[PDB]
Amino acid sequence: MFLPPPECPVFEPSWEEFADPFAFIHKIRPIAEQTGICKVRPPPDWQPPFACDVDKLHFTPRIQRLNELEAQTRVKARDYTLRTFGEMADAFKSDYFNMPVHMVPTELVEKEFWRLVSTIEEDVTVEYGADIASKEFGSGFPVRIKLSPEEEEYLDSGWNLNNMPVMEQSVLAHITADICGMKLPWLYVGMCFSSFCWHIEDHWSYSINYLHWGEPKTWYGVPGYAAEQLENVMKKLAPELFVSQPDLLHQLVTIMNPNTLMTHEVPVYRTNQCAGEFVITFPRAYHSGFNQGFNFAEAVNFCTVDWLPLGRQCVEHYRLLHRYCVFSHDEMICKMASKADVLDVVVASTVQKDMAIMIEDEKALRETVRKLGVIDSERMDFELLPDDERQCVKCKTTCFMSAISCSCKPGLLVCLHHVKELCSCPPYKYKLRYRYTLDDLYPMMNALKLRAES
């Protein structure tokens, strides 16, 4: 038996409300942050054109076992076209139920998914596609052949997910480090029972997902305030998932029945996303789900000004866990401060507040390491090092504001929380390597204040 969670909020914005996605997301946040996920139905005549040759789009499929609480890797040998994948997917579903595909009720697919993942005797395996856009398989939205007027109409829409990162209200917008995972949309080609395991987004970002066409995508979501409650339940039932991971390519995730979370007082919400609808996930909101049949979705991460303090909290949380970072949060803040004259004024005001916290934290850490006997110092342009050359030996954080080095261990660095973890030499042999003096930093913050105060 399966008891479906309550439905998540559904929004139907007018065209006036829809025109600015960031204003709309800010508006619905008091409701939707209490449920973790929400669904958005665009105005009826917002219909971006979907056109592709199913024989020229192709991709390498991933394969997936469907066992509850079994470890799966979040990021991982033949090849499908969009046509031959669809032929396999449709035959799979109609053979599984002995019915035509658009006659299998969504409630029955959901009930059967939770039965099959729970029984050991069933050995069902399925396949799917997942990758960023490429010449072999591009975005489902229009991008800059000669375009039709209809395609040109949607090139610069705020809800064209290619544009979402680069708009003037995103802060991930101007990370200069190429981070393919956080500005570039992912494309998901689904079949019946293919499933995304429970997760949150890197650096606790938002995400937004559009179903271009096909059968529905079923979601489960948990509000950000219950994240640690969910993690405690999973640690108790699946401890193998919580061992320390060697790389960011070795993150373990799993399938888990939402009734198990609800039994343990974790709030969970559900929805069926149909073609032409968006789903939005909020910072630190856990989510999972599965595809009802052959379909095609596109999704991207993004960060608003609301998110900025949560981003700083996330990197602190990563430090406690010795988890790798995708980018340096402080590097992003300082990059924006160096471009204060071109920032949105509301963005400038919010970045200024986070910068003030950063500067006071850095002042206190530098005083502590001076009292430990580190005397020598030198400026160091951390942004020029490859990421894997500026991680703290102990906690793996990506350094940018400062670090400690010692000529006895050439090339190694610790962050200023881990001065005692670098080597056995006494601290007077160490050097403080810093990006900025405090005297460089206060004028940078003042530029943001001037930009914000007009």
Annotated binding-site ranges for 2-oxoglutarate: 128, 207, 209, 217
**Shortest gap between Cβ of 64 and ligand B6T (angstroms)?**
7
Helix axes 438-452, 329-338, angle to 10 degrees: 60
What DSSP string runs through 149-215?
A: HHHHHTTT-TTSTTTGGGSTT-SGGG--S--HHHHS-EEEEE-TT-EEEEE--GGG-EEEEEEEEES
Q: Pick between residue 37 and residue 448 the one whose CB is nearest to Mn ion.
A: 37
221 binds, among ligand B6T, Mn ion, Zn ion, none (CB under 5 to 8 A by kind): none
**Shortest gap between Cβ of 79 and Mn ion (angstroms)?**
26
276: left (phi over 0), alpha (psi -120 to 50) or beta: left
From the list 192-200, 226-234, 243-251, 411-419, the region that binds ligand B6T by CB under 6 A is 192-200
Any contact of residue 21 with ligand B6T (CB under 6 A)? no
Any contact of residue 272 with ligand B6T (CB under 6 A)? no
Amino acid at 142: P
* Binding site as annotated, residues for Fe cation: 199, 201, 287
What DSSP string runs through 87-148?
A: HHHHHHHHHHHTS-GGGS-HHHHHHHHHHHTT-TT---EEEEEEEE-BTTB--SS----PPP
Closest CA to 382 of 438, 335, 446: 335
User: Are residues 358 and 333 in contact, defined by beta-carbon separation less than 8 angstroms?
Assistant: yes
From the list 234-242, 291-299, 331-339, 345-353, the region that binds ligand B6T by CB under 6 A is 291-299
Q: Which of 194, 218, 272, 350 binds ligand B6T (CB under 6 A)?
A: 194
128 binds, among ligand B6T, Zn ion, Mn ion, none (CB under 5 to 8 A by kind): ligand B6T
Q: Which of 109, 314, 340, 415 binds Zn ion (CB under 5 A)?
A: 415
Give the CA dihedral 252, 255, 259, 261, nearest 10 degrees: 10
Q: Pick between residue 106 and residue 377 the one whose CB is nearest to ligand B6T.
A: 106
Q: What are phi and psi of 423, to 5 degrees?
A: -165, 175
User: How big is the chain, counted in residues?
Assistant: 454
Report the C-alpha gap between 278 and 268 in whole angstroms: 19
* Binding site as annotated, residues: 128, 199, 201, 207, 209, 217, 287
Size of the residue set binding Zn ion (CB under 5 A): 10
Report the C-alpha gap between 211 and 368 in whole angstroms: 52
**Shortest gap between Cβ of 220 and ligand B6T (angstroms)?**
11
Q: Pick between residue 88 and residue 147 the one whose CB is nearest to ligand B6T.
A: 88
Q: Compute the C-alpha angle 333/406/244, nearest 5°.
A: 65
Report the C-alpha gap between 284 and 266 in whole angstroms: 14
From the list 188-196, 261-269, 303-311, 382-390, the region that binds ligand B6T by CB under 6 A is 188-196
Place of tokens 């059968």: 215
Any contact of residue 214 with ligand B6T (CB under 6 A)? no
Q: What are phi and psi of 167, to 5 degrees?
A: -80, 165
Q: Pick between residue 203 and residue 217 the one whose CB is nearest to ligand B6T.
A: 217
Q: Pick between residue 85 and residue 434 the one whose CB is nearest to ligand B6T.
A: 85
From the list 31-39, 168-176, 191-199, 312-320, the region that binds ligand B6T by CB under 6 A is 191-199
Residues lying near Mn ion in the complex (CB under 5 A):
66-67, 122
Any contact of residue 291 with ligand B6T (CB under 6 A)? yes
From the list 27-35, 106-114, 269-277, 387-395, the region that binds Zn ion by CB under 5 A is 387-395
Closest CA to 402 of 434, 380, 374: 434
Q: Which of 143, 321, 425, 438 binds Zn ion (CB under 5 A)?
A: 425
Any contact of residue 74 with ligand B6T (CB under 6 A)? yes
Q: Which of 24, 80, 141, 188 binds ligand B6T (CB under 6 A)?
A: 188
Any contact of residue 185 with ligand B6T (CB under 6 A)? no
Q: What are phi and psi of 288, to 5 degrees?
A: -155, 175
Any contact of residue 404 with Zn ion (CB under 5 A)? no
Kindly give the residue spans of alpha helices, DSSP state H, lying in 189-304.
227-237, 258-263
Residues lying near ligand B6T in the complex (CB under 6 A) are found at 74, 128, 130, 188, 190, 194-196, 209, 217, 291, 297, 299
